[PDB]
Every structure is written in C-alpha cells, then in structure tokens.
C-alpha cells in the first residue's frame, strides 16, 4: 500500500521519514598490497583479511575502461583497517570502505627503506572510483585516509610515494591551502625544530591516535605517518615548523568534528 510494507508478524509504515538519517560509511581508507595481483587476490579472499576493492598496478581495459575487482559489498564491512583510530572513532572496519592498490610497498635497500612509485594507470583508475564512493556517502575530504593514518604504530601504507596532492586537486581528500601553510610558518625555516608535545596535540585533534604516555619511538611513528601523507619530502618523524604549519592549516580548513 501507499508507503506500507508487509512482514511475517507485523506491517511497516514508511510514510514518515526522519530528517536525522545519515550513512554508516564515513571513511575511505587507501592501502597497498605489498604483493602481486594473484597473490593479493588470494589473500584478500581468505579468512584473515579482506578489502572492498582491489586495483591492479595497471588495470586491464575493457569497453575502454579500467577493470577493478570488488571483493566485498560496500554495505558490509571488510577486514582491512584492523586495530585503528581516526577522529574520535575506533574499529574503522565498521565505518569505512577499504581500497587495496597492488604496489610493492617498501623494501630495505642498504638500510634505506625505499618505497615503490605508483603506476599512473592505477591512479587514473582510482580517481573515478574514489569520486563515486565519496559522492555516494558524502565522505568529507579529511576522511580519505591512509591506513598509516589510522594505525600509525602498525602500518606505513600507502606510503610517501602515494600522490595525495594529485588526488586532492581532483577533489579527493584533504590538502592545506599553501598561503595558509606559509601564514602558520610565521617566519621559520621549514625544518626549524618545534616542540614535540605541541605538534602531537594538533595531530591528535586532526585525528591521529596519540596516547598520553608514548615512547619517543611511538611519538615518531605518529609524526612520520602524518608526514608520509602531508609532507612526504621528509618523514623522519621529527617535529618541525613546516609539519606544524601544515597541521595548523589542515585544522583551520577541515576542523576536528
């Protein structure tokens, strides 16, 4: 009937819709696989981890379009985030979509952890899928994140070679206004040392997991995670003026929720 639904035991009347109704999905998490396509597909369909999408390094094309693998209906959670925290939330699996990108990650080469560049074909395939996802759920720019952002002590992915600024120019994810980063730099050289505690407060509020008593090591991983995303020219995890100014400009533009 007119807005009425039948069931075993009861009728539902759907005629009155509440104003306060919002997606359960709020977060888009970017990963790399650190493994080849067939191997990643095997792993992400097994019983320990999964993701909603798997993008090959160079997706095959059909009907003039890159093909991407969907492993898990978006309505359902995938096992991609693990133990995690972002902007007040935990258990990020519950509220996120996870995209896995076939990419080798890091390999230590004479002690120097070297990351692998992202195939431009892959990024090109990613853009329309991210846009559709972001439209569908009205995902806010600051909630397009790296796995490292939501689990900084455990993960680096997708790493400092991931083109966040390029994506931001396509309307995908958060990026600070350059004039405001300069404003907050406030006359300092970019690498001028800044007070670690003060920087960590800002990162906490922007959304990073920061606990009251952390070893220097653990404080470095948080700052490093932030730099890999937002200041990838140097991601050694030391608090400096440029890192702080970026955090300050991000907070000004996107807030904290």
């Amino acid at each position: 009937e007119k807005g009425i639904v039948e069931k075993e035991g009861y009728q539902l009347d759907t005629r009155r819709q509440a104003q306060a109704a919002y997606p359960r999905i709020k977060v888009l998490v970017i990963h790399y696989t650190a493994d080849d396509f067939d191997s990643s597909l095997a792993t992400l369909t097994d019983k320990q981890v999964s993701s909603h999408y798997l993008v090959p390094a160079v997706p095959p094309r059909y009907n003039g379009k890159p093909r991407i693998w969907q492993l898990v209906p978006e309505q359902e959670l995938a096992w991609h985030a693990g133990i995690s925290a972002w902007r007040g939330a935990t258990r990020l699996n519950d509220t996120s979509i996870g995209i896995e990108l076939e990419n080798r990650g890091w390999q230590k080469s004479a002690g120097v952890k070297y990351f692998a560049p992202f195939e431009p074909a892959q990024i090109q395939a990613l853009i329309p899928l991210a846009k559709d996802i972001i439209a569908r759920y009205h995902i806010k720019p600051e909630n397009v994140v790296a796995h490292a952002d939501i689990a900084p002590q455990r993960k680096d992915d997708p790493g400092p070679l991931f083109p966040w600024q390029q994506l931001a120019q396509q309307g995908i994810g958060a990026w600070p206004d350059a004039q405001r980063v300069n404003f907050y730099l406030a006359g300092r050289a970019p690498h001028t040392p800044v007070d670690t505690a003060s920087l960590l407060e800002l990162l906490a509020r922007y959304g990073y997991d920061v606990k009251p008593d952390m070893t220097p090591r653990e404080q470095r991983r948080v700052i490093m995670a932030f730099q890999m995303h937002f200041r990838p020219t140097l991601y050694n995890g030391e608090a400096d003026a440029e890192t702080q100014a970026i955090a300050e400009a991000l907070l000004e533009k996107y807030g904290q929720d």
């Binding site: 696989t33 320990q48 981890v49 096992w79 991609h80 693990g82 993960k155």
Partner: peptide, 4 residues
C-alpha cells in the same frame, strides 16, 4: 598491507 591490510589488517579484523
């Protein structure tokens, strides 16, 4: 990467 991934990773319940």
């Amino acid at each position: 990467x991934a990773x319940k």
